[PDB]
Design a protein around this ligand. Sequence first.
Ligand SMILES: Nc1nonc1C(=O)NCC1CCCCC1
Ligand SMILES: Nc1nonc1C(=O)NCC1CCCCC1
Lengths: 237, 237
Amino acid sequence: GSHMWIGVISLFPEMFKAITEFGVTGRAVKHNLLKVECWNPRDFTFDKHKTVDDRPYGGGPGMLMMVQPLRDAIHTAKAAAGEGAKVIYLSPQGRKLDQGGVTELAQNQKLILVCGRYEGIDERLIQTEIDEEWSIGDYVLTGGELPAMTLIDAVARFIPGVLGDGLLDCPHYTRPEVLEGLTVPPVLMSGHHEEIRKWRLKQSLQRTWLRRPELLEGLALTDEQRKLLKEAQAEHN
Amino acid sequence: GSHMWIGVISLFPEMFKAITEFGVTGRAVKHNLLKVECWNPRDFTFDKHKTVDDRPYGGGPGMLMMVQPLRDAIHTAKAAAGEGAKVIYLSPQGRKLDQGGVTELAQNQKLILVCGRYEGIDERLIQTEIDEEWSIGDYVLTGGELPAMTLIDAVARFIPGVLGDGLLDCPHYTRPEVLEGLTVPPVLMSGHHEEIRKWRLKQSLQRTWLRRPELLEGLALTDEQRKLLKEAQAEHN
Ligand SMILES: Nc1nonc1C(=O)NCC1CCCCC1
Ligand SMILES: Nc1nonc1C(=O)NCC1CCCCC1
């Protein structure tokens, strides 16, 4: 119902087939719940070799994205989007993406994602063309395409019809009942939905505490969560 | 020279064309510096509909990856890799990936990346088949393929011949000298390499301090870095 439009600026638009042609996101595109539209800076060049990079002022080992083709591609995308479109640049210098951030971005009906290549883009373009800068993680990649697709996949899950709480997920079990000597926890076989809910919640609480203690600090646990966590920490001791 | 082999278990192997056919990583594959080999659990099914999912014990809204096809695919990949291969599962419950973690993973000559779909995989498979669990970020995606590709792209940068310090990157500038009233910092035009190096370092220090203060805590700054940062904080005031 509340479909989403995402414009993409990229030198390798065919990379985005990975999300538009496969799985849940592929279905979302086919069903017109999500639309991904790509513009290639190479198409906006004029020199006879279609040059899309340029030398950095001050010297340096690498190259930067050439301003004019990239600038023109962005302007074209903005015009196609109309008013309301938020322009986002993916880079390690951006705001750290988390699920809260995903929910925020997902409120936007229109996004334009600029995918950097080489050593990046001109700083003045960030000032004049980019509304927000985001990062998917503290690591370095060869291009902004994978971060853009990661963002798209993340926000797509919030679009109505695409699918079917601060804690890590509980463990999951399926057939067979015994796998290499390891049995399914009896509570999951019991058929008692309330016990199953509490066990799963307790497991999530235990796993978050053991693996990601800092995530617990940012939460105000319910009475039930405080109790189950206490139980888990007592059993762990 | 120190090429890398990465095995992938995925229901959508064609997604990985995004990294194997394009850009820096595409070149790495063509030049045999990086090899990405995929196995599809669907190929290991036997039922007439090639079923790759299964119902979770204890009930629940979603489905899990079916154990037998996934187990068989993993075993096949391991056999193809031989000894030394580290098997990695991508999920939000994994160890948080950062650049330090990328450098660690990049030491491995062989990796096998298991890409979960649906609600995930059986916990006992994690215990019996998975060596390490990693996460690219605190957000939820539809599948492990994008995280796997993100990891591959990240570690590929450390392979010799693929390409050409705790701080955020400095701003970059290219042509033209004036862009919508915004000029290139004169120091980058000066031709004085030492001044340019110090300005870039100071900019990185300033940006890290303003955007990601916590990253500074984890660093032991050099005498020069302490001074340039002090200068930046004085100028900011
Ligand atoms: N990490 C990240 N989070 O979002 N993007 C990231 C990245 O590593 N992007 C690669 C590009 C970014 C532009 C400069 C060239 C490298
Ligand atoms: N975040 C992440 N970091 O690594 N993987 C992530 C993820 O969100 N993976 C999606 C899959 C994970 C298996 C269960 C179904 C969802």
